[PDB]
Design a protein around this nucleic acid. Structure first.
Lengths: 32, 73, 36, 27, 254, 436, 9
RNA sequence: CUCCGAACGGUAAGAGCCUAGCAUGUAGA
């Protein structure tokens, strides 16, 4: 039951982390 | 020097140490000394290849371990 | 090791077959009946 | 017994699958 | 260095000899020379590359030929000491210490020769590389192989060879190296020569074979339950003698 | 033997049918109920929720009890066989296959239970720690400047060479010397069609990598090992060809762009020379590694994670693969890692772990170990052990003595699953560490 | 039972 | 430096002819 909720939380966390990492890498590439 | 196995399937598995160029009379003496039977009564065979009391040992060319079916006269 | 027992069984069967073949048409069965 | 029986690796009494005995007069 | 390792190798070789000599007759005989095995398949035998001390007795090297005067008996060279058929395979491997030292000495000369060729406008001269042809770190034949360009575009074969145990249902001893990229991991023809020398040459090692006669006065290869029968017949005198089994001689009906 | 136990169980079932609720003597039933119980036990042997319907309550209860008894006897026989497995005591030829099959079905049930636990329960991968590991990999890639995988187009020269090499490897693995099967003929035919039509084969493989996001039933096979088993899996032939293709492409791209560091690299060399010599000489080539006049000390840490398989974040695997490889091939690899599993009769569950038998698996495991190495060894230590991308170091070399003299760790190695560490540290750090 | 068995086999 | 072992795993099976050391001691008319 809670496994699906934990998996959805992990997926949302991974998506947010990927978006933030892409933004940070773009900012660094623009800075360099 | 040669080691011979005067063997039989009737409670006589004897190991005599024979000389190289020796005769068979002395070999029969040793077989009696280790087996416990009169000298002239012993008989040695290998499928009716009766070895005689004058033909030498190196004549047949026995070597270490050549067992011999023992029989009595 | 068991191959020896298998070969022994095969040889025993072959020997029984040969004995039956020699006895069925034997001189005392076939040739003896040939005179009758 | 024609061999030396000293160059052998550790020892060889008999590999005939019957070594019931264990002795060599070391003590 | 592992004494237990060598002792266990000897025990395992003896265990194989069990049923290697017991497969024929359930006796476990006394003497039974290893020459029934250490003759390679080129002559007919097995090719048992052994490591344990298989002492060959001096009373198993007798041969004669009745040609012009009579049966001139002879014997191989065993007056010094016992016959050491397989003294040690470690002596004929060039171990990793010698391998690394020879590599450090040889790859530098290879680079020097390559620089001299690039300067002198020379190609891959196999004659010049014949001195540094032995093993390299991988086999130098791979450097001058036929699939050099085709094999150079594949990096990372060690992991593939490692996980081949999952990609295949059979043990693949390829951890040591790759047969293509790394080349060969040993050489043994010198060991075969040493073996045939210790057995008293071909004529000495073959006095047990039945072709003392057979209309074959010389060595001419004609190698055509085929191998089991061929083996137990080609060693029937060396096997079915009297100084191995007990002396319960039995003759046949005819 | 077990036959006596089975006969006793059958006799107990007959006695239960006669006495345990026989529904009165009115021309009662026969061994058909025994056949139903045997079928139910066979169904349970598949680890399925099937049972023995079509009977009353106490009949079903007695059937379940007898099935549990027979299964306990089978598990006990399997434990007794596994006890005489390492040593063996000269086991026979027929008992080996029976013990292997029993252990195989036991492991199939265990893997099914693990997959069901991962599904119903939520044993996640420490989502905070997961985001941390992802950020660490991001910074590592940014520091190394290792670009991602430019997925193969149909406009490359050495792609035909890679396809021919994959065909050669698959042929050398399939048929070694006089070996064939019902499906092995399919593999030989696929290899022949590829050697004949390499362009069409490469186009088909590109179509699979761009569109194919699934896989067929992969079988399981246990290698007849004594101590540690080597489970070999079966795959599809065209799937195998595409697997080898994109695998070898990933290997070539990584070797070209240096996608892997030297320490995590069982690689082009022999294991004993490289490992022993480099390791020992690095232990000897350190900056006064053997000096103990100042109370210094040295330690060696050898271990094995035992968690590079069956405990991996598949979602994190897909995330990292997208971070380092394009979406198509990365998603295809993530799908093939958890495609399907099938026993002789059972159907094991995917989404539990990595399928090591599938091709292109060594890249996955090495990248997983690389992530774990970036986690354990850290950033500065790895940045000093590797060196910059403009001038990296050797397997155990450095740009200067200060690169190793600063941190405690001086040398590192890593196998497919093994790991080895050697670090020096002064007595002040020793006292602080023991205090902690 | 199953855990220790699968761990040591 | 004296501790030395024996049996089985072994002798194909066969049709015609021939020779013999051994064994009961009785019930009953």
């Amino acid at each position: 039951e809670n496994f699906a909720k934990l998996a959805e939380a992990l997926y949302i966390a991974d998506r947010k982390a990927r978006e933030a990492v892409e933004m940070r890498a773009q900012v660094e590439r623009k800075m360099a | 020097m040669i080691e011979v196995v005067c063997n039989d399937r009737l409670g006589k598995k004897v190991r005599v140490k024979c000389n190289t160029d020796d005769t068979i009379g002395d070999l029969k003496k040793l077989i009696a000394a280790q087996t416990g039977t009169r000298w002239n009564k012993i008989v040695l065979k290998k499928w009716y290849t009766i070895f005689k009391d004058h033909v030498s040992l190196g004549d047949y060319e026995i070597h270490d371990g050549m067992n011999l079916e023992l029989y009595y006269q | 090791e068991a191959r020896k027992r298998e070969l022994k069984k095969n040889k025993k069967q072959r020997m029984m077959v040969r004995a039956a073949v020699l006895k069925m048409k034997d001189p005392k069965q076939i040739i003896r009946d040939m005179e009758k | 017994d024609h061999f030396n029986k000293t160059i052998l690796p550790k020892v060889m009494q008999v590999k005939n699958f019957g070594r019931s005995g264990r002795t060599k007069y070391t003590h | 260095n592992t004494q237990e390792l060598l002792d266990l190798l000897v025990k395992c070789e003896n265990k194989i000899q069990t049923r290697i000599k017991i497969g024929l007759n359930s006796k476990m005989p006394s003497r039974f020379p290893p020459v029934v095995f250490y003759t390679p398949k080129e002559l007919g035998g097995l090719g048992m590359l052994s490591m344990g001390h298989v002492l060959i007795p001096q009373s198993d090297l007798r041969w004669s030929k009745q040609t012009d005067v009579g049966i001139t008996h002879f014997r191989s060279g065993m007056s010094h000491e016992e016959d050491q058929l397989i003294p040690n395979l470690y002596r004929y491997i060039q171990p990793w210490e010698s391998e690394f030292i020879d590599s450090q000495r040889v790859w530098a000369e290879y680079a020097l020769k390559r620089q001299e060729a690039i300067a002198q406008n020379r190609r891959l001269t196999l004659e010049d590389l014949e001195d540094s042809w032995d093993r390299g770190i991988p086999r130098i034949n791979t450097l001058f192989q036929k699939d050099r360009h085709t094999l150079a575009y594949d990096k990372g074969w060690r992991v593939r060879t490692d996980f081949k145990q999952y990609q295949v249902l059979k043990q693949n001893p390829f951890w040591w190296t790759h047969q293509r990229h790394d080349g060969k991991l040993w050489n043994l023809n010198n060991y075969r020569t040493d073996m045939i020398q210790a057995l008293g040459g071909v004529e000495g090692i073959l006095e047990h074979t039945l072709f003392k006669g057979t209309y074959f006065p010389t060595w001419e290869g004609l190698f055509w339950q085929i191998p089991n029968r061929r083996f137990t017949l080609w060693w029937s005198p060396t096997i079915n003698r009297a100084n191995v089994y007990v002396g319960f001689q039995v003759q046949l009906d005819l | 033997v077990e036959s006596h136990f089975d006969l006793e169980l059958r006799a107990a079932v007959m006695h239960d049918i006669l006495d345990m609720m026989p529904e009165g003597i009115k021309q009662n039933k026969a061994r058909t109920i025994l056949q139903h119980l045997s079928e139910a036990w066979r169904c349970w042997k598949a680890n399925i929720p099937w049972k023995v319907p079509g009977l009353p309550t106490p009949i079903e209860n007695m059937i379940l009890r007898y099935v549990k008894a027979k299964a306990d006897w089978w598990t006990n026989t399997a434990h007794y066989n596994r006890e005489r497995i390492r040593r063996g005591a000269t086991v026979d030829k027929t008992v080996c296959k029976k013990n292997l099959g029993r252990l195989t079905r036991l492991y199939l049930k265990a893997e099914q239970e693990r997959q069901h636990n991962y599904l119903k329960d939520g044993p996640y991968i420490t989502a905070e720690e997961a985001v941390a590991v992802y950020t660490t990999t991001v910074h590592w890639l940014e520091s190394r400047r290792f670009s991602p995988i430019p997925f193969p187009p149909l406009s490359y020269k050495h792609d035909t060479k890679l396809l021919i090499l994959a065909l050669e490897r698959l042929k050398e693995a399939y048929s070694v010397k006089s070996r064939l099967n019902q499906s092995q003929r399919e593999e030989l035919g696929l290899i022949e069609q590829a050697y004949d039509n390499p362009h069409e084969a490469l186009s088909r493989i590109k179509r699979h990598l761009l569109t194919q996001r699934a896989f067929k039933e992969v079988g399981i096979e246990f290698m007849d090992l004594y101590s540690h088993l080597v489970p070999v899996y079966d795959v599809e032939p065209l799937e195998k060809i595409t697997d080898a293709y994109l695998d070898q492409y990933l290997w070539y791209e990584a070797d070209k762009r240096r996608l892997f560091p030297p320490w995590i690299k069982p690689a082009d060399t022999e294991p004993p020379p490289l490992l022993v010599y480099k390791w020992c000489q690095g232990i000897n080539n350190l900056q006064d590694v053997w000096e103990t006049s100042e109370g210094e000390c040295n330690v060696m840490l050898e271990s094995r994670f035992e968690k590079m398989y069956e405990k991996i974040d598949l979602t994190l695997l897909n995330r990292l693969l997208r971070l380092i490889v394009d979406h198509n091939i990365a998603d295809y690899m993530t799908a093939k890692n958890n495609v399907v599993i099938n026993y002789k009769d059972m159907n094991h569950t995917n989404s539990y772990g990595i399928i090591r038998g599938l091709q292109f698996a060594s890249f996955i495991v090495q990248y997983y170990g690389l992530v774990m190495d970036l986690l354990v060894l850290g950033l500065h230590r790895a940045s000093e052990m590797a060196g910059p991308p403009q001038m990296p170091n050797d397997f155990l070399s450095f740009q200067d003595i200060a690169t190793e003299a600063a941190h405690p760790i001086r040398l590192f190695c890593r196998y497919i699953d093994r790991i080895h560490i050697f670090f020096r540290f002064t007595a002040d750090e020793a006292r602080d560490l023991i205090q902690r | 039972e199953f855990h220790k068995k699968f761990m040591e086999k």
